[PDB]
Design a binder for this molecule. Structure first.
Ligand SMILES: NC(=O)c1ccc[n+]([C@@H]2O[C@H](COP(=O)([O-])OP(=O)(O)OC[C@H]3O[C@@H](n4cnc5c(N)ncnc54)[C@H](O)[C@@H]3O)[C@@H](O)[C@H]2O)c1
Lengths: 104, 105, 70, 127, 188, 105, 153, 234, 150, 164, 94
């Protein structure tokens, strides 16, 4: 009984961490709340680096490929969603993009 | 940590730890019970097997047996699965042939 | 183990007390049977020391009954 | 009764030394009065907003001006003794930085990896 | 190196009987040295009045590294007999010469138990060994391979072991008769 | 309790029988749970006392075959010491049985 | 409820109810929500892990319990968080009836998942047993298509 | 915790046996009479007559009153030390502790003190067992007995947090059996009549004995073989 | 948090689901039982582990009664998943006074009891006597002179 | 009351409460003691990759070998910045440094003794300091990380000359 | 309290009655639909077997049985049929 109780307490402390706290995998509230407008994004993550690098490329001519500043399009909202979040699969979407027409 | 948790779970399954320092008692001196595996050609009720293998000298409802558990080998289980798969295929093919030749006849 | 050791120590003590009570009730039944067989059957009596002890303890128990009744 | 030591409650020293919020290490055996419970939040928030008023007449925790940050306190290392200024009961809490030994490659390495002059005040350096 | 030890075991008021252990230092130099030092028990540290006063405590107040006045706490009839606890006679804590407990993984791996009457280190963990030693009594215990470490064997005194094993067990879990160790020494 | 509870506890034939027939959510009270645990442990003690009395009966029936003649007092003492039953308390119990029989008659 | 309680407590303790930045920040920080974990009501009257040694015979030689396989089988398992499952004789399982309900119920306030029972789809796809909102089985679209195509309809 | 019965080395084994042969409730009256006589002697020597005197001719009564003895307390040293040296060392051969002398003022405290000491001097259950062990023949017959007792049922008691004063008030107001409460007292012998549990156990034991008779006669194996033959035939 | 979720009650059938928890003894409010193991078990595995006779014996229905709660109808057959009320109901309906008379209960005596006041026997040994409820509850039962007649 | 006129939607509470995000970036910024579920979730996820990987046992979790403590002990991370004005072109006996708030006097003296070899340290004067706050061109309030000021005292005055 | 005509609804004011079921299997409107509950003008068995299948279903009927034995279930019992299963003759509607 002593060894069994130790084993069961270990299993209990394992399952508690595995199941708690229970957060939902994904809900539409995530995408509803982490939506910020262009003005809000610009107000949130802006530095003089963009204007300075614009002047620098205008004066030099070097080709820049990646943006010089990391843009967080959520304005600090992406850190609110749990890390294991992923969009669920939606079967039979009511859209026309999956047909891939090129003539209309 | 993966290697370590594997080793530790193996040790725990072996059951070698004991708070009073010292080797644990042996398993053979403890397991005061026996198991009997009987092969049957068809399914039989557990209460039937119990009343047929019960000890006639034990005045207890368990009749000298603890538990009777029925199982099927993995070979025959896979055989039954393949058999039902083939049976579904055969039903589909027979219905297809019937509905295809009902108009040809 | 610290939680489970007294739980089995108490059971062991209870088993020992059960055996002691078994011995005591067996002695009581022995007394009752020897008594209701000696006074029933004939040519079967206790030794002299046993008879003297039984008589003195009978007198003591009668005195105790008188004390508890008074 | 509380879980944190009664000297943490009211400092054993006469001048109230050792009173306030003391964060403890997770592996440390000592406990602190920093608890995030819904029932322990009022007192721990009052300790930051107002502070504790002592009988001697001096305000020990949050004397005024700037509120402290209890989450960034270095972990507790011991308990105050009246004989000395401080009594250390846990030595593993105090981190001990240690340098690795030198080696033929160690003294040959450099911070950056080698990929295959007059200072001029500039308003912006790209890289 | 002296590879022979002896102990005097007494069962309550009975006469002390001699038991002899023969150890193998080649396959496990740590446990054999620990057992030899614990059976020797160099505790002749004699202090003076002023010395004891400035130290405030006799050095004998702490547990002494010797099997003297020890007891055999675990005596199970048919399997083995365990004893040698130092800090207390109950058998709930170990203590080695190096410190609280040592470890010898390369030795405990190759340690095997194939004979009746072997001697091993009674431990809770395969790498947490102390002063508690157990003498096996059963035929063979192969389930202990790779868990405990064997260092020696009872050379003379199998009759003593079998006589100690036949002690009635008190409901408290300990032997009813206090099986203790009168003296213990090393023979060169 | 309620009047209907009194009626049903008189119907089923006893408070203990009622508390044992009711189980789990059917017995929502906590006084009932406490008194049921007490009744359970008391019943276990009753069974233990029954086993005790049966053991005593078997012991006296086994050892009476050696003191039935009561021909040699030393032989009776040997039979008593074979099992280890005290003699002074035995004589005391004999005297108590004598006084009880005298009071009965 | 808890938010209002904490707000009143902080207002009575450390809030001066002035335009100070302290109170201005408290009025917004107190709206944060604390951790919620369903704590089952402990039973000090009856300790379930104590009845392990109950209703068991013991060997008179070694003075320890007998590992009865019949008892080990018929033992009823009571659940608890620190003591995940505990065996207990079936005679004493009646006193632990409420722990069974508290364990079967989802460890979450019903009004957080009440959006399930308020629609027909979830009312049909979910289970409501002892207030346990655990989703039932549901075939995949590929699975149902394969089943129907094998059934030829 | 293991308890060891200890006897002070003040008295010898003979006096120890003489004292231990007395029952506590019976030796209490002996102690009471001894202390009453010595207190009466002390009061007569001092000059204060504790005994009642009729105003008609001033005669002395028979003996001091037990209620007066219980109400009498020791406050003067010349009285308390005298009675202590007279009864504690004289008739019981005990010695008091310096700190214990602070509580030894009351005569009821003296009674409780000497009672606790004689209870401690009385042997314990472990010592009684070590004196009288169980024999192999008794073990053999108890094993041959078919039924065996079940244990551990004491663990099924409802364990609650109760104070001594609360329990005493409960006992005084008869609340021990109110609101689904009870008191567990171990009883070796049980009253056997109208006991449904005992009747069920008697019936079970009789059925077990009949089953034993059947299996000894061989009819049980006959029925089992008949069932086997029926299952083989159907 | 729940580390171990108790399995559904009376889950002994290999193919059919167990009866509702309210019918087994748990909480009411549901009209159908469910088992995660029986749901996740494939149909071919069910048919392999079972046989036709066992399937028929498990599909044997007791409409419209119940097997585990005898004497009353099944909660799934009832309109509301809660048990019936007209069978077991309070002893006093709404708008009804408590005009219940004094009932006399049968009791089995264990000893020849002789009433000294009236000068007669209350009941012979092992005799079934119709006695007063309060009398049996407060006087006969405690002295163990008689036990309830069942 | 006409309840049938409305549909089944919960109206917003009046007055509406503010978001729990603290928007003050001044001298009196307060640390929120209330613990959120997302904090525990993120802690567990960074600890042992929840919920993909199985959780390590309680022994390894509470031991000194758990990955965060092991990495903090074998690869310490402490940002120690020297003020150039305090020691540049002036023989100063009290050089000042900037450290994280989780360090102490003993931590800093051990740091300087073991890593940089500055053993002769007389006394370290500790004084916390709120992080530097500023506004950018668009007016967004961005505050630098907090830092603890330390004023270490040496036996000999030191100076690093700037070759002009 | 007595909750005399109090409009306590979660969507109305966020307060619910203290004595009520947190879950309802069938809304009160569904219970009132006695036409779908009882057997009124409505079929109860949706399985239609062939002639050979009916003879196989009638083969498992035990001898000594009679239709007069099975009574009509009361109105407070749902009219459902599980098809041809074990002891199907006991079901009145089947
Ligand atoms: N008020 C009414 O009862 C009502 C109203 C309209 C029509 N009907 C018709 O009356 C007949 C008997 O009604 P009832 O109430 O006695 O029984 P029912 O309709 O309730 O049950 C008849 C059983 O036979 C089956 N069945 C029905 N029509 C069938 C067919 N053509 N071939 C094979 N199986 C068939 C049903 O599915 C059911 O199993 C049915 O044809 C029904 O459609 C009845």
């Amino acid at each position: 009984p002593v060894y069994c109780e130790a084993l069961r307490r270990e299993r209990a402390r394992e399952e508690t961490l595995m199941k708690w706290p229970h957060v939902p995998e994904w809900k539409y509230e995530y995408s509803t709340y982490t939506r910020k407008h262009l003005a809000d994004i610009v107000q949130y993550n802006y530095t003089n680096v963009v204007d300075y690098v614009d002047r620098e490329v205008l004066l030099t001519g070097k080709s820049v490929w990646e943006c010089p500043i990391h843009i967080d399009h959520t304005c600090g909202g992406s850190k609110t969603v749990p890390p294991h979040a992923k969009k669920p699969v939606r079967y039979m979407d009511a859209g026309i993009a999956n047909v891939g027409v090129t003539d209309i | 940590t993966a290697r370590a948790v594997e080793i530790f779970k193996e040790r725990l399954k072996r059951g070698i730890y004991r708070y009073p320092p010292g080797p644990p008692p042996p398993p053979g001196a403890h397991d005061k019970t026996s198991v009997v595996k009987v092969e049957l050609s068809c399914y039989v009720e557990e209460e039937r097997l119990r009343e047929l293998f019960g000890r006639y000298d034990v005045f207890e409802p368990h009749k000298g047996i603890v538990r009777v558990e029925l199982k099927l080998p993995d070979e025959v289980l896979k055989q039954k699965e393949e058999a039902e798969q083939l049976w579904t295929q055969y039903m589909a093919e027979c219905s297809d042939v019937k509905a295809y030749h009902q108009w040809s006849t | 183990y610290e939680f489970h050791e007294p739980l089995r120590r108490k059971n062991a003590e209870d088993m020992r007390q059960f055996q002691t009570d078994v011995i005591d009730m067996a002695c009581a039944m022995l007394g009752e049977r020897l008594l209701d067989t000696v006074n029933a059957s004939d040519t079967s009596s206790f030794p002299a020391e046993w008879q003297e002890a039984i008589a003195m303890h009978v007198e003591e128990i009668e005195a105790e009954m008188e004390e508890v009744a008074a | 009764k509380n879980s944190w030591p009664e000297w943490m409650d009211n400092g054993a020293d006469g001048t109230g030394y050792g009173i306030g919020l003391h964060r403890t290490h997770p592996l440390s055996r000592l406990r602190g009065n920093l608890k995030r419970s819904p029932s322990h939040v009022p007192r721990v928030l009052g300790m930051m907003i107002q502070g504790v008023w002592h009988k001697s007449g001096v305000k020990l925790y949050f004397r005024g001006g700037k509120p402290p940050n209890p989450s960034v306190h270095p972990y507790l290392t011991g308990e105050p003794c009246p004989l000395y200024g401080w009594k250390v009961t846990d030595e593993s809490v105090i981190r001990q930085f240690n340098m690795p030994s030198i080696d033929g490659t160690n003294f040959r390495y450099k911070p950056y990896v080698a990929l295959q002059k007059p200072l001029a005040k500039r308003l912006f350096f790209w890289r | 190196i002296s590879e022979r030890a002896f102990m005097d075991i007494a069962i309550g008021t009975k006469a002390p009987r001699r038991i002899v252990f023969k150890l193998f230092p080649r396959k496990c130099p740590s446990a054999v040295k620990n057992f030899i030092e614990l059976c020797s028990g160099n505790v002749s540290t004699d202090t003076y009045e002023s010395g004891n006063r400035d130290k405030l405590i006799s050095e004998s107040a702490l547990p002494q590294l010797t099997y003297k006045n020890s007891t055999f706490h675990r005596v199970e009839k048919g399997y083995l007999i365990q004893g040698g606890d130092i800090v207390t006679g109950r058998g709930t804590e170990q203590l080695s010469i190096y410190g609280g407990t040592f470890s010898a993984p390369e030795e405990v791996r190759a340690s095997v138990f194939d004979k009746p009457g072997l001697v091993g280190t009674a431990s809770s963990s395969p790498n947490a060994h102390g002063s508690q030693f157990f003498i096996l009594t059963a035929k063979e215990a192969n389930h202990l391979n790779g868990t405990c470490i064997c260092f020696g064997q009872v050379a003379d005194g199998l009759d003593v072991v079998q006589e100690i094993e036949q002690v009635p067990i008190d409901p408290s879990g300990f032997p009813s008769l206090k099986v203790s160790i009168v003296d213990c020494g090393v023979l060169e | 309790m309620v009047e209907a509870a009194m009626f049903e506890v008189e119907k089923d034939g006893g408070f203990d029988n009622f508390i044992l027939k009711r189980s789990g959510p059917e017995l929502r009270s906590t006084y009932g749970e406490r008194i049921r645990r007490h009744i359970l442990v008391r019943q276990k003690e009753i069974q233990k006392n029954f086993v005790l009395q049966k053991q005593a009966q078997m012991l006296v029936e086994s050892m009476e075959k050696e003191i039935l003649p009561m021909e040699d007092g030393k032989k009776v003492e040997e039979v008593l010491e074979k099992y280890g039953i005290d003699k002074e308390q035995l004589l005391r119990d004999i005297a108590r049985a004598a006084v009880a029989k005298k009071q009965q008659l | 409820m808890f938010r209002v309680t904490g707000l009143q407590l902080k207002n009575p303790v450390v809030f001066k109810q002035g335009q100070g930045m302290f109170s201005h920040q408290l009025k917004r920080l107190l709206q944060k929500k604390s951790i919620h974990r369903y704590n089952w009501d402990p039973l000090p009257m009856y300790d379930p892990r104590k009845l392990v040694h109950a209703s068991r015979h013991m060997d008179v030689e070694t003075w320890r319990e007998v590992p009865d396989p019949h008892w080990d089988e018929r033992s009823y398992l009571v659940p608890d968080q620190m003591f995940y499952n505990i065996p207990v004789p079936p005679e004493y399982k009646d006193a632990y009836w409420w722990r069974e309900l508290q364990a079967r119920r989802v460890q979450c306030p019903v009004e957080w998942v009440s959006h399930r029972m308020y629609n027909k789809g979830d009312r049909q796809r979910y289970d409501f047993q002892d207030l346990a909102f655990r989703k039932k089985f549901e075939f995949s679209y590929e699975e149902v298509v394969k089943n129907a195509k094998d059934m030829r309809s | 915790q293991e308890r060891r019965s200890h006897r002070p080395p003040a008295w010898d084994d003979e006096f120890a046996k003489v004292v231990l042969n007395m029952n506590d409730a019976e030796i209490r009256e002996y102690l009471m009479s001894k202390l009453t006589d010595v207190i009466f002697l002390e009061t007569q020597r001092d000059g204060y007559e504790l005994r009642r005197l009729d105003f008609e001719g001033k005669p002395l009564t028979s003996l001091p009153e037990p209620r007066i003895i219980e109400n009498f307390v020791l406050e003067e040293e010349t009285i308390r030390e005298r009675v202590i040296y007279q009864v504690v060392e004289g008739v019981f051969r005990l010695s008091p502790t310096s700190a214990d002398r602070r509580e030894l003022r009351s005569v009821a405290n003296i009674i409780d003190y000497v009672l606790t000491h004689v209870r401690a001097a009385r042997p314990t259950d472990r010592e009684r067992r070590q004196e009288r062990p169980i024999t192999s023949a008794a073990l053999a017959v108890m094993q041959k007995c078919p039924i065996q007792p079940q244990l551990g049922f004491v663990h099924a008691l409802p364990h609650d947090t109760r104070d001594a004063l609360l329990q005493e008030w409960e006992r005084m107001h008869h609340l021990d059996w109110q609101f689904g409460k009870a008191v567990y007292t171990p009883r070796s012998k049980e009253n056997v009549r109208g006991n449904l549990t005992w009747l069920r156990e008697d019936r079970h034991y009789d059925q077990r004995m009949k089953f034993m008779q059947e299996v000894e006669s061989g009819e049980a194996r006959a029925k089992h073989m008949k069932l086997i033959a029926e299952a083989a035939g159907n | 948090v729940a580390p171990w979720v108790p399995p559904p009650r009376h889950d002994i059938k290999v193919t059919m689901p167990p009866p509702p928890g309210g019918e087994v003894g748990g909480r009411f409010g549901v009209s159908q039982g469910y088992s995660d193991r029986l749901a996740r078990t494939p149909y071919w595995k069910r048919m392999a582990l079972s046989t036709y006779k066992l399937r028929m014996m498990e599909n044997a229905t007791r409409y419209p009664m119940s097997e585990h709660r005898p004497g009353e109808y099944d909660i799934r057959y009832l309109p509301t998943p809660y048990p019936c009320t007209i069978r077991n109901r309070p002893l006093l309906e709404v708008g009804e006074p408590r005009q219940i008379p004094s009932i006399r209960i049968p009791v089995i005596f264990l000893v020849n009891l002789f009433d000294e006041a009236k000068g007669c026997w209350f009941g012979r040994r092992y005799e079934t006597v119709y006695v007063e409820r309060q009398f049996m509850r407060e006087e006969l039962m405690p002295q163990r002179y008689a036990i309830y007649a069942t | 009351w006409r309840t049938w006129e409305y549909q089944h939607t919960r109206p917003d509470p009046r007055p509406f409460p503010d978001p729990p995000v603290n928007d003050y970036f001044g001298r009196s910024r307060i640390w929120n003691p209330i613990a959120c579920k997302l904090g525990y979730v993120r802690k567990k996820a960074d600890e042992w990759g929840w919920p993909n990987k199985p959780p390590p046992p309680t022994g390894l979790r509470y031991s000194q070998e758990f990955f965060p403590f092991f990495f903090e002990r074998y690869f310490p991370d402490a940002e120690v910045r020297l003020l150039l004005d305090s020691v540049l072109n002036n023989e100063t006996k009290r050089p000042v440094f900037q450290i994280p708030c989780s360090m102490s006097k003993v931590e800093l003296v051990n740091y300087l003794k073991n890593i940089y070899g500055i053993d002769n340290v007389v006394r370290v004067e500790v004084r916390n300091r709120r992080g530097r706050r500023y506004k950018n061109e668009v007016g967004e309030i961005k505050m630098m990380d907090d830092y603890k000021v330390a004023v270490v005292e040496l036996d000999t005055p030191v100076s690093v000359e700037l070759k002009q | 309290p007595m909750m005399l005509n109090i409009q306590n609804m979660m969507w109305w004011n966020g307060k619910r009655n203290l004595y009520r079921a947190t879950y309802r299997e069938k809304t009160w409107y569904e219970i009132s639909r006695t036409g779908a509950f009882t057997k009124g003008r409505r079929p109860v068995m949706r399985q239609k077997y062939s002639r050979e299948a009916l003879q196989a279903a009638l083969a498992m009927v035990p001898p000594g049985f009679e239709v007069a034995d099975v009574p009509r279930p009361p109105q407070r019992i749902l009219a459902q049929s599980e098809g041809i299963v074990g002891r199907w003759y006991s079901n009145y509607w089947t």
